[PDB]
Design a protein around this ligand. Sequence first.
Ligand SMILES: *[C@@H]1O[C@H](CO)[C@@H](O[C@@H]2O[C@H](CO)[C@@H](O)[C@H](O)[C@H]2NC(C)=O)[C@H](O)[C@H]1NC(C)=O
Lengths: 49, 50
Amino acid sequence: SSHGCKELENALKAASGTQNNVLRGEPFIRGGGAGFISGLSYLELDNPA
Amino acid sequence: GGCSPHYILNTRFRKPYNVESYTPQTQGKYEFILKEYESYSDFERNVTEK
Ligand SMILES: *[C@@H]1O[C@H](CO)[C@@H](O[C@@H]2O[C@H](CO)[C@@H](O)[C@H](O)[C@H]2NC(C)=O)[C@H](O)[C@H]1NC(C)=O
């Protein structure tokens, strides 16, 4: 009597992912009080208006 | 001499003789640029012999 077995497994995983997130803004003011200019031109990203 | 009335808001100024103008030409330019980048990559294997 004689017996043989062979067993083989191969498994592969590959994963990938990317983000690009660009934000730009350029508020511009002429006239009025310099403090109001600077305070308002400063970009409140939550309220760009 | 001089002593022409020059005002900014309610404040009145005396201009130097040398100065032609000093005038409140107010302006403001803000500029915001945010760039975020991510990459990930994953690699695995599992391999068996009996
Ligand atoms: C290689 O084998 C391991 C062990 O089985 C794998 O990780 C297991 O995966 C199962 C199913 O996703 C989970 O339930 C187990 O909790 C994991 N255990 C561990 C220790 O990670 C792994 O995913 C296999 N990799 C490949 C490329 O085949």
